Design a protein around this ligand. Sequence first.
Ligand code: A1ABJ
Length: 284
Amino acid sequence: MEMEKEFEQIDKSGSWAAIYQDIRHEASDFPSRVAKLPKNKNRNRYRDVSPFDHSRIKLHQEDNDYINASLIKMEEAQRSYILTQGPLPNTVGHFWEMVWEQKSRGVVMLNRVMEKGSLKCAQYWPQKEEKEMIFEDTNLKLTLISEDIKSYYTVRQLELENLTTQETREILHFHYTTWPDFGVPESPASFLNFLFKVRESGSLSPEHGPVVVHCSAGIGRSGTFCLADTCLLLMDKRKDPSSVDIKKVLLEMRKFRMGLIQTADQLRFSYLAVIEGAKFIMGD
Ligand SMILES: O=S1(=O)c2ccccc2[C@@H](O)CN1CCO
């Protein structure tokens, strides 16, 4: 059923809460035993948001391999994403270790460091060229190379150095800075513009490791970004775009990380983004 008609039918009937709860009911439940070990309590931002054991990213170290991060592997769409929490004061070195080990080209940040007057993630990248950051626990150096500030997002070029080998890589930081403190954006136009800037960079392409995507918990805004990208890609490669089922794509993605899309308003916003984005994909 053409999702644009499914959309008007749910909107006229005001059933968004009902659709959303049906997804919550059918979603996968897999063990997260590593996340709940007592040694890992200060590596989790939220007690109720954990990576499944089967899909968690492992750090390459014998001490403790744990980070709150999941690999979302979309077989047909041929896309992979790492979804993670906003880094904590004691996990900023783990965060950059993961970007290095997984060969990521891009980091996508969908939150501000402070929202609603509280800290939602650590200040984990340098704000000035001449003040680099050293992560002594993981042996990495991070330098700000350049910054491009736009009305709805900022793009940064960063240099990450493995201090053990003196290899360096360019990482691109895509920072969406205008998601409102409450609710979802009124129009998806600026979110789609941002998505298209990340795609244009190469950060989502198979020649690199998976893109790292985060917000505060790494399930709500982060879920909206990967759901929209995957649905638009499937509309492109398929003979019949109309066969793309957003609810089924979301349930597939929830096999790899719990809780993706946190509210009925985030579900409706995801539909709006895919419907408006398709008017490019289908040749405009
Ligand atoms: O490729 S999907 O994301 C996809 C695409 C279009 C319609 C439905 C679906 C779902 O089955 C989940 N997917 C993989 C498992 O089948």
